[PDB]
């Protein structure tokens, strides 16, 4: 019973939980994020994940291939999924570069982010305890910004390519290359350690968080909504995007993984178990982070909203602080970042495998013709690496933020989710889909799933996608920095590179297929056997 969950759950429990959810929650002012978060969870999160698993089992094919047997017109969903994955794999691994650099910096008698007598520091520094006594700065935040990140004043100023992080990206990509080449997977005796250790570390950090003198204010900030001010579009898209990103839906790798599953199991109950497990770990890491932030507010004498970066760096500001308040800091630092790498890589391997096993479908007689696969993996890793380098320049943080918002996040996931639900529920037919599910697992989806696909999910996706474009506000890196319009254009280009796959494939397949126009439409709407 546990063996399967222990093996597979690590594939998409990952940085989305321990890293992304906390900084998106902080960015959106804490507890206000939870309302739309759970609304999306129980409206579209679990049902759409179940639907993806059902598609995977039903069609036994990857994203590029399966939709041919459901609705040929909307096969563009496969290319959208594959390109979303091909963009996620580029920037998702950059987080592991920072984690690796932190880990290699941990091998010291005293941690570099514990004090600010070190060289890279501004003269405006003071140790947190001394900030009680202005423009004062905290050693952890400026370590993050100037040693690890060496943050340039803007995306317009890429600066030098940091060799110490470039070699980290190389190391992580070599790990991925050899693991995917050798077919390494969580099935050996190491599975227990690899799957259990992250949760033990999360328990440790949870207890370290709640015990601190300032934890209560942090939890109050974490759990108290402000509905009267914060119900702008940003929180709604961020919550829906977080749900869709964490469950890895609309990526197509879920359908690829699901194709290996067995139909004899109670897929419904297992989907509920996996969803509850993942959302619970996210929600609990929320307590850990925000109790640490409450302590930072207590110690520094600034409001909780101002203590740390309102951006990707939050985890690398919060946890590095936490390990500075535990006995023998170096031991916990090494454990934490080895844990973070083990948590991220086990999921990075799954996407990369999905990417390869999907791309082979574009030319199986040429890419899968033999030894070529061992070279194709090297090609994919090389191209992803050389694109990753852009995020490792001194200005790379802004590029990473732009990618993290637009490339595999935001309106594009809403777009793909809307089209999946719309196709299956209305073009293919919810009743036909329920009959197929009856054949597969022996019982119909029921009302919750049926209405989630037919009404709730389309309404939520379209509502957010419209609301933001009505109440639009642009991206920022921290609370202050505003992107130039050309960078916003690049971000929208990353987003649209996946969205346009559906309309363009519709056009391509209408034009290619013969006959009068209604014949074309009907012939491409009706499923292949």
């Amino acid at each position, epitope marked *: 019973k546990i063996d399967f969950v222990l093996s597979v759950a690590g594939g998409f429990v990952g940085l989305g939980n321990v890293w992304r959810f906390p900084y998106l929650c902080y960015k959106n002012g804490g507890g206000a994020f939870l309302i739309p978060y759970f609304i999306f969870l129980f409206g579209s999160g679990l049902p759409v994940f179940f639907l993806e698993i059902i598609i995977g089992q039903y069609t036994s094919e990857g994203g590029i291939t399966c939709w041919e047997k459901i609705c040929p017109l909307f096969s563009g969903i496969g290319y959208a999924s594959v390109v979303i994955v091909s963009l996620l794999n580029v920037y998702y691994i950059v987080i592991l570069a920072w984690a690796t650099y932190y880990l290699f910096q941990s091998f010291q008698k005293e941690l570099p982010w514990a004090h600010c007598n070190h060289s890279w520091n501004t003269p405006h520094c003071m140790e947190d305890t001394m900030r009680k006594n202005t423009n004062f700065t905290s050693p952890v935040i400026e370590f993050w910004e100037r040693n690890v990140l060496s943050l340039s004043p803007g995306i317009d100023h890429p600066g030098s390519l940091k060799w110490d992080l470039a070699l980290c990206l190389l190391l992580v990509w070599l790990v991925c290359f050899f693991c995917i080449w050798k077919g390494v997977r969580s099935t050996g005796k190491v599975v227990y350690f690899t799957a259990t250790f992250p949760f033990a570390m999360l328990l440790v950090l949870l207890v370290r968080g709640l015990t601190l003198p300032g934890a209560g204010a942090g939890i109050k900030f974490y759990l108290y909504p402000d509905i009267t001010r914060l119900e702008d579009p940003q929180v709604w898209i961020d919550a829906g995007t977080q749900i869709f990103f964490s469950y890895a839906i609309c990526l197509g790798a879920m359908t690829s993984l699901g194709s290996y599953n067995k139909y*004899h199991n*109670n897929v419904y109950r297992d989907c509920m178990l996996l969803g509850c497990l993942n959302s619970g770990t996210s929600f609990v890491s929320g307590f850990a982070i925000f109790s640490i932030l409450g302590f930072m507010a207590q110690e520094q004498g600034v409001d909780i909203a101002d203590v740390a970066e309102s951006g990707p760096g939050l985890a690398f500001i919060a946890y590095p602080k936490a390990v500075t308040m535990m006995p023998l800091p170096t031991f916990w630092s090494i454990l934490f970042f080895i844990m973070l790498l083990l948590l991220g890589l086990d999921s990075q391997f799954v996407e990369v495998e999905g990417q390869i096993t999907s791309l082979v479908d574009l030319y199986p007689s040429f890419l899968r013709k033999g030894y070529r696969r061992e070279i194709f993996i090297a090609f994919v890793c090389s191209i992803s690496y050389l694109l990753g380098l852009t995020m490792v320049t001194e200005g790379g943080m802004y590029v990473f933020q732009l990618f993290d918002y637009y490339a595999a996040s935001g309106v594009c996931l809403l777009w793909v989710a809307f089209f999946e639900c719309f196709v299956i529920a209305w073009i293919y037919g919810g*009743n*036909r889909f*329920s*009959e*197929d599910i*009856r*054949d597969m697992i*022996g*019982f*119909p989806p029921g009302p919750w799933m049926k209405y989630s696909w037919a009404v709730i999910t389309p309404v939520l996706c379209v509502g957010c996608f419209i609301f933001s474009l009505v109440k639009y506000v642009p991206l920022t890196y921290n609370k202050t920095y505003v992107y130039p319009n050309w960078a916003i254009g690049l971000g929208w280009s990353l987003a649209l590179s996946s969205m346009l796959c559906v309309p363009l494939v519709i056009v391509i397949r209408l034009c290619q297929t013969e006959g009068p126009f209604l014949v074309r439409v009907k012939y491409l709407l009706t499923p292949r056997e």
Partner: antibody
Amino acid sequence: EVQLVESGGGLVKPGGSLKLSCAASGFTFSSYAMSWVRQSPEKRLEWVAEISSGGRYIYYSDTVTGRFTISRDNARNILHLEMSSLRSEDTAMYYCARGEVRQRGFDYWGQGTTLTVS
Amino acid sequence: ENVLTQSPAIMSTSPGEKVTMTCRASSSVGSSYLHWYQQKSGASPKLWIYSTSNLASGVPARFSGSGSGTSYSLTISSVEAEDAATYYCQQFSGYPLTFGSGTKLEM
């Protein structure tokens, strides 16, 4: 209250053909899979054929897979079974049964109709 | 086809006594896919148990079931004259669907 009522059973010569009917009421007939189950004169039960809720998937027992055709009429809310060449072993009492959830057995059974091949 | 057989085809019984009967399969059947039906003399069968243990809507609480894999059983805590009937075990895991040989309580 749910209702199931078979009809059309009767007397046939060996190798003859006959068509059974099973009227349904009290539930959305298009939303539930339906099955025919057969009781021998020795009172032994045997399964015959299942038709899915919509009708895209159909299953037959190996003893009838070549001779019996199942069908449904969702608009008329009636279940049909057609027998092409009734062998000596096919004489029995035929029940139509509602079977949507495989993890919940057959929910309800019709009154049934006898069939004889004398 | 997965043949199912039931152990005590015919059974003597008296009111108030406890009763038990078993069902065996030629192949393993999941806990969720085996069901029991009651047939009164000269009447259509009715669903009686629809899992390893789950009781039907109208069955008296005195009934119970158990088992997994290749073996299953049904039991009655204390019988009554109203329970004189024939009981069939049925597997729902894989086609062709099969009913057990059935067991009759004679009193």
